[PDB]
Amino acid sequence: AGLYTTYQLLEVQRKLKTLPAFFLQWFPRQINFQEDMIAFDKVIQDVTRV
Amino acid sequence: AGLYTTYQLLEVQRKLKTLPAFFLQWFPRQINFQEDMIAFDKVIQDVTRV
């Protein structure tokens, strides 16, 4: 004391919230492209006929 | 873009319908005959009589 109260310091309590990955388990593939759009093709192939 | 866009194509999504063999599993014997017809004989012998 006197001019100023003396202190001891203890360890700093650092909480660190995260947002852990859950829905990215269903998105396995990473495909990069330097192009404008991404197109797909869906094709239904009717086979089961006598 | 400009005149028209560019495209990165991913894999073709092929919906394909089959009809797997459930009834053929009781028909094991295969006969590749060149003749006309196929003759069977069935014989029932009644013995259980007094």
Numbering used by the authors:
A (entry chain C), B (entry chain B): 2 to 51
From the paper:
YSD1 has an icosahedral head organised with a T = 7 laevo symmetry. The mature head contains 415 major capsid proteins arranged in hexon and penton capsomers, forming a shell that is remarkably thin for its ~650 Å diameter. This shell is further decorated by trimers of the auxiliary protein located at each threefold or pseudo threefold position. First, a clamp formed by two loops, C1 and C2 immobilises the E-loop around the threefold axes. Second, trimers of the auxiliary protein dock at the threefold axes over the clamp and E-loop locking in place this critical capsomer interface. In both YSD1 and λ, the N-terminus of the auxiliary protein staples neighbouring capsomers by interactions around the twofold axis augmenting the major capsid β-sheet of the E-loop/N-terminal arm. However, in the flagellotropic χ-like phages, an additional hook-like structure formed by an N-terminal extension connects trimers of the auxiliary proteins. This interaction mediates the formation of an external protein network that braces the inner capsid shell.
